Amino acid sequence: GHMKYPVEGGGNQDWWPNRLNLKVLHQNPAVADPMGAAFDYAAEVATIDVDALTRDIEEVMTTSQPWWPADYGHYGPLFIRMAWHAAGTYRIHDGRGGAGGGMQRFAPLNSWPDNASLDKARRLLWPVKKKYGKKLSWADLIVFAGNCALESMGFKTFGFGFGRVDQWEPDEVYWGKEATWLGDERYSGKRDLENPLAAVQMGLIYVNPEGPNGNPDPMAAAVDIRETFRRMAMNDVETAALIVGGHTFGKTHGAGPADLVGPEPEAAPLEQMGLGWKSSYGTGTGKDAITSGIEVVWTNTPTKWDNSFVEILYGYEWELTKSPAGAWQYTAKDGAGAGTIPDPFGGPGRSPTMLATDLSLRVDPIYERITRRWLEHPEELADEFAKAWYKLIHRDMGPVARYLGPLVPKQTLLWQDPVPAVSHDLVGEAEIASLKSQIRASGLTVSQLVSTAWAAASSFRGSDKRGGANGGRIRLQPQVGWEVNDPDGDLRKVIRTLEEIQESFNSAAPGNIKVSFADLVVLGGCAAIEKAAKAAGHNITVPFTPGRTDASQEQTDVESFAVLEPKADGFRNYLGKGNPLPAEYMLLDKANLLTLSAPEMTVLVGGLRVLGANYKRLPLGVFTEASESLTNDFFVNLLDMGITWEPSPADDGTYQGKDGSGKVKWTGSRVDLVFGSNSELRALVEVYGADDAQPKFVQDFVAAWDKVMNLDRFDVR
Amino acid sequence: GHMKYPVEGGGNQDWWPNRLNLKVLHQNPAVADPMGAAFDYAAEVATIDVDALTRDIEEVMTTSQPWWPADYGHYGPLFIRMAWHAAGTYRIHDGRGGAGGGMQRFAPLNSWPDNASLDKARRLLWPVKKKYGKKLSWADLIVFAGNCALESMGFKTFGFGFGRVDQWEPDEVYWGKEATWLGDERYSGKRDLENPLAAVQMGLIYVNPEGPNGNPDPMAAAVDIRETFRRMAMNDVETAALIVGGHTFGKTHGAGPADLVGPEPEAAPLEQMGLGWKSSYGTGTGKDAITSGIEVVWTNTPTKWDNSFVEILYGYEWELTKSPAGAWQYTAKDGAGAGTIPDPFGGPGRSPTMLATDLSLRVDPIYERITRRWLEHPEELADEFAKAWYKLIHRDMGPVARYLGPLVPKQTLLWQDPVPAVSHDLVGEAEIASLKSQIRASGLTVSQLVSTAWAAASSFRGSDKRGGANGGRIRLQPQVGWEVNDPDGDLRKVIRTLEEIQESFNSAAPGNIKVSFADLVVLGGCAAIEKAAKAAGHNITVPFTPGRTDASQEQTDVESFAVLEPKADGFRNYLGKGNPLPAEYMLLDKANLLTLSAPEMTVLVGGLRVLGANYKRLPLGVFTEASESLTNDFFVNLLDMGITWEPSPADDGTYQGKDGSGKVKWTGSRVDLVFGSNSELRALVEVYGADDAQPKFVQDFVAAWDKVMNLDRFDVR
Ligand code: HEM
Ligand code: HEM
Ligand code: NA
Numbered sequence A, B: 001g002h003m004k005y006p007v008e009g010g011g012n013q014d015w016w017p018n019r020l021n022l023k024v025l026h027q028n029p030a031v032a033d034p035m036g037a038a039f040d041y042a043a044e045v046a047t048i049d050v051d052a053l054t055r056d057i058e059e060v061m062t063t064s065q066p067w068w069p070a071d072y073g074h075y076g077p078l079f080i081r082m083a084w085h086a087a088g089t090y091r092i093h094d095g096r097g098g099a100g101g102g103m104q105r106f107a108p109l110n111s112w113p114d115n116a117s118l119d120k121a122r123r124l125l126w127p128v129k130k131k132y133g134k135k136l137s138w139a140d141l142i143v144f145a146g147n148c149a150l151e152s153m154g155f156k157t158f159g160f161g162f163g164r165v166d167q168w169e170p171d172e173v174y175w176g177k178e179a180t181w182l183g184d185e186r187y188s189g190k191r192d193l194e195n196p197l198a199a200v201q202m203g204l205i206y207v208n209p210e211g212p213n214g215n216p217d218p219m220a221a222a223v224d225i226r227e228t229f230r231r232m233a234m235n236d237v238e239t240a241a242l243i244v245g246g247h248t249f250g251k252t253h254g255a256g257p258a259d260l261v262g263p264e265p266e267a268a269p270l271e272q273m274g275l276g277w278k279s280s281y282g283t284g285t286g287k288d289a290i291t292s293g294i295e296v297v298w299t300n301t302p303t304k305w306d307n308s309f310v311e312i313l314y315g316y317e318w319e320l321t322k323s324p325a326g327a328w329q330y331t332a333k334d335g336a337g338a339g340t341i342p343d344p345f346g347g348p349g350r351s352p353t354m355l356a357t358d359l360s361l362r363v364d365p366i367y368e369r370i371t372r373r374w375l376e377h378p379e380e381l382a383d384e385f386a387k388a389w390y391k392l393i394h395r396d397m398g399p400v401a402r403y404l405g406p407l408v409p410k411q412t413l414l415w416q417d418p419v420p421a422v423s424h425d426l427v428g429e430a431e432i433a434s435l436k437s438q439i440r441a442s443g444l445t446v447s448q449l450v451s452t453a454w455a456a457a458s459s460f461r462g463s464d465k466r467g468g469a470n471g472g473r474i475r476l477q478p479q480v481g482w483e484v485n486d487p488d489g490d491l492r493k494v495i496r497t498l499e500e501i502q503e504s505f506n507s508a509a510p511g512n513i514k515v516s517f518a519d520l521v522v523l524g525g526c527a528a529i530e531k532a533a534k535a536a537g538h539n540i541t542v543p544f545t546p547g548r549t550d551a552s553q554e555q556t557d558v559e560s561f562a563v564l565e566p567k568a569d570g571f572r573n574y575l576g577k578g579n580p581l582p583a584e585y586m587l588l589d590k591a592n593l594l595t596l597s598a599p600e601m602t603v604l605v606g607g608l609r610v611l612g613a614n615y616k617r618l619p620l621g622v623f624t625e626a627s628e629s630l631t632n633d634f635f636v637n638l639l640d641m642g643i644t645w646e647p648s649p650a651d652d653g654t655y656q657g658k659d660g661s662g663k664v665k666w667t668g669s670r671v672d673l674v675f676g677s678n679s680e681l682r683a684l685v686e687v688y689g690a691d692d693a694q695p696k697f698v699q700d701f702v703a704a705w706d707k708v709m710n711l712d713r714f715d716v717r
């Protein structure tokens, strides 16, 4: 090999391929943002003329462009595929992917094999982006176009929320280990798909349209469909409705041999203006288009909503055949239905065809019961598809406070993890100060209050904006039983004591002021940090913003919240089972899910350690003689060369720090020691460990703590 | 091969290994900075107590620590090597390397083979860093410790300037293509070292201490010493003075076999706390230390300044021998001087020894004349070593205004590219407004005024902070003759006209007011932009900061400025010969040298195209119907899918853009089309090409233009 210039990718990872990469903590940096610090997308959206935008998109859909002519004179079906693929990268294990960031317009997503021809689809929408400018993000426009396509062709949607802020460099996500496009090294056992992946091959959205590993077995395909769609939060009914609703429209494209199609966009020459897959087969577009290599038109009305998909699926019998490009597909036996399917550009009619994965909807016994019902009750298909499409397009939107615009339906939905609206006045300064005194008098310790507030708030992940302290779900299933929240420990005791303080305050509060349990959990940790700071000689106030409300168990989908359980939390020195990488890599990944920077991660680790937030109160990394006071002792002692560190004499993967005499003075984990070992992290530790640093450390810790407490608080932003 | 998690380095560069990498435009981002917004290091170190700092460094140097015992009870010599190595990565071709960023504490430099044991040297100075905190950067401390070491051991230095600002992630620099440490794939012809490299092997500072490629021929080693030191801005006398002065102190380390030495720091295990090269030979430290593998003690007084080096070099005849580690070195013949050299820890005396590169100073005829002079008159060595050392550790400090503290010497120095002090009152806003009016009436076109101002200001490079518009050197050699600056003889007219305006204004100036030619060059460009903005329907004021002064030719080292001539400037669509990468890669490298972000680079390109700033006024990229008018037409037309782009029939790296009628409408270069092709850059073009974007584009362009104009203006910052 050869090292390259940095402008062509060269860097330190070339010399140390397995090295920790702190760059995951400065994605989408502000310097790369052309918007400027004061840009307020929520304010811009609040002025869009949605009616005019809808009409402009309708005009785009029906004005064929010569560099990519419109099938059946309507770009609508292409836009529905575009939006489904935009939202279709989402996965429940880490919440990454989805349409919330407009990542389809960036690498690697813009060059995935499954996203072929969507470069043209996005390009066709520039006249709309041009007209509305900063008032309309690409992220919102890409999925709104699909929604507009559905409605222009006869399907009434449940609603739509704006508010996806455009980003300026791609979100870097692990999509699999395979170094070859469409590769498959992600299965073990019978058919166990590797966590956290939610597609069957590298570069696919969900499953292979020719069946598993190219084998058109519809029964086996249904196994992959059920599992990948499950990992995108869709059940059997939602999955069938989505696939039936989608393939009601449009067609596939495989008019000629695939080896006439040029490189994907990121590998394409300059003159192609960011487009890829340039084909030399005929015109390369339109009637000669090659996208997937399959040549299927599902229904006889590809630009209209109706029930002809299930009517055709159950109306014919199906046999295996090949497309002009050599891909497996199915067509009606016995020449049935010849000439009944229209051609996109006025040619002769064709025969009915289906993908192997479409036939899964009829061959799989669960899908068959669902889809056969819709033969005589298409009103139930329309209702399920509207609910599933709405959930698909908004899955990573977070709390409903973020949904913007005039098309947001206000019905509450269980999958949105709803919290009640506020129904009383909120606590003010005098009540907050009075609730703080009850907490100090309750006997709850700094460790208990800090650990409980962190456990509730650190369930947030910025990937799909789920979790957080709002809802007070730490006292509900499944969070109250999570191992890292330690049900065996004081958690139930802390919950009971906080509920007593809540009831006690609410029975004598002024006016109709009342405090929620969810607010009291956060307030307790804030009050404990104020006490711990004073105990170290710092008079500081921790910010506190009220307004969290208390969800009930009936409003908390227990199974849905399973994916939010921390399998690792280096901020509590906790490492569960099943993590893909050593503990210091999972620490950085956890900090990324919390939207934390490297300095913010560093102050929080050092602070939480000396506050007693550790899992099971382990002494690992507690480099202080003044526990439960907020000092910078963690950083001072970590940089002390009077300590000699060694792997423990037990073979448990921890470390022993010995002083000059040989006595073990400290113990620590990989998460603890990486801050004194990694050269970029140690640079940060040396800032907070200096003689002048303790006021700055306390200030920075409180700021990072306040950030974590407020991660899900879009209701007051 | 397999793809990896982003937290383990995985990213888009794995899938497209040669893709344009915009990371070079968001290095050291603010979010990774622990110091925050208003932190001003210059303000901090300006109040440091230098006398106390020197005594604290003095105590560190004479207090041996058990994990790395001090040779001869004094760490001074180790700190001199540390400081020399910190500054020793600088190279003239692109100004990168040097000690100005403290990069020796980060990868890859902290793990270079030549920087072995310097991990321990930096570690010894944490007590000093800890005591002074944010008032003292690691960047300053590393070279100041070497400067204090010289003084502590009897050498009076020329002075010292503080002000090197610490960074928080490594600057990524092309150090060579070799993928193996100590590799050599950088020579062509007889012995032409690859530009921009200034070292003979990957991971070396300058030359191989065993001779070229490990062959101990002193005459051949002198060839490599002369060329690499030349590429580090040192002539023959400076080179010899540095080597003689340096090896007056200390010893090499090679007590045992080198395969007992463990991995470099970035590959070392956690328990070693960022240190590397852990050795299992004896104690692995002190008398058993293994650093380079050579075991040489140059002088009989390793902790004292005297003339021992050349006395020993010429007082013995030398023969080739081997160190205990198998490295080539020289020792005195016939057992001469046995037992005359002291042992670092009290062992028996040793015989005189020298490196093969030390013998170059006697074998090479140029070096021999220089070093025999110091054998006869040692007073001249102290003078030359002091001047070369001060230059070494300040070479990348930029304008003299950046030198802070009470140790800064007042003397003018040619290598600093000095500019005269302001001796008059500066023009006020009334005089600025008048001068802008006179420039716009002078008959100089907007193209001429913008081209000349950019040519003067864009000579700056942030790597070593050389160049820029201050000094008015656009009218002096060599800048007045650079191909990109004066292609067809137009620049002479522009200079004479601005000089006439300068003479006229100063003759009639009120009071003590005087304006410089250097300021007028910049002010002319700002007036031209105000005019072009009005032509496009935007009344705007371009900011201007007076205070530049006019350097003379006698104050302008003509050959030193040769490395600042652009071989490529995508902002003017100029591409000379000898570039290592295609033009769009050179564009990003240039923007990096101008310290520009990707949005700033994007607005400047689109603006300078329509302002007529292209080299030779080529129509490449001038996508507008209205030249001399500041519009966003570059971005609107670049996004126009009514244009079809193809490579020009002549394979000259240009493109033709044909509109609907197949007629050629626009032409462009690779630099132009990359903004419509690259997915991240096109996202920026779509911001500035929208209907709502004309006011924002004019604001952002003017701010970006003003930034480039003020790049070297450290006199006001
Ligand atoms: C098992 C799940 C699915 C598979 C295997 C699959 C596969 C495919 C393939 C291979 C194509 C042809 C692309 C081409 O050659 O142009 C296609 C087209 C399309 N897909 Fe799907 N898809 C699935 C689910 C969905 C869903 C859930 C939706 C929307 C809710 C959808 C909407 C569409 C539409 C509208 C088209 C037509 C595109 C056009 O007319 O250009 N699909 N699908
Ligand atoms: C051709 C140029 C040079 C070569 C090949 C060279 C090479 C070396 C080598 C191999 C070592 C031994 C490292 C070890 O094993 O610990 C060393 C040590 C040292 N170098 Fe140089 N060097 C050069 C120039 C310089 C310069 C210009 C300076 C300072 C102005 C300098 C200052 C030192 C000092 C003070 C030591 C002793 C370090 C100690 O005692 O630990 N050298 N050099
Ligand atoms: Na996501």
Ligand code: NA
Pocket: B095, B096, B097, B098, B100, B396, B462, B463, B464
């Ligand atoms: Na530099």
